[PDB]
Amino acid sequence: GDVEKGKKIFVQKCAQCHTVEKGGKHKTGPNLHGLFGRKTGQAPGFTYTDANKNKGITWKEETLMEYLENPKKYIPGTKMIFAGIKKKTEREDLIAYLKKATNE
Template identity: 65%
Template sequence: MYSITVASDIKKGANLFKTRCAQCHTVEKDGGNKIGPALSGLFGRKTGSVEGYAYTDANKEKGIEWNDQTLSDYLENPKKYIPGTKMAFGGLKKEKDRKDLIA
């Protein structure tokens, strides 16, 4: 089981989001969609379910619920985890980076 620990660096995670994710995503409650879907309220949500965002069929049909583990697996290699996704991101190969980002 995947777990975020106190060893996760929230500051580093915020910087990773700013440099690797914020161009395409928002995390604010009313941030809205950009090139990618809004990420506010991500945990517990099903893939492909943000209203007003044009997902690929692959994202809509994946049918998983976002949690620490599924998000880490996705962020490691998005195109491998959801073949057919339009997310143009090569992934975060280091588990520590993924844990920091998710924290």
């Protein structure tokens, strides 16, 4: 998973709604710091849909690969408006970026 390639994918597809920094700002979407190994819907100070709050999985590589491929299929009724990233490589690249960025 190429971190630098993941950076650019994040900017293109994710940055309009999400920050990755520790104590970063909530926007349209929750700040993503400390994402890995946390349950869905647990970012402090963000109002989630009941669907995201009660999804009840743990974020990791496996779960992110499935989610980012098709958000609304994984979490029906999410308010995250994003169609998905179809390609495996692109997703692994992005997830590599997040593993690092959301843990610094």
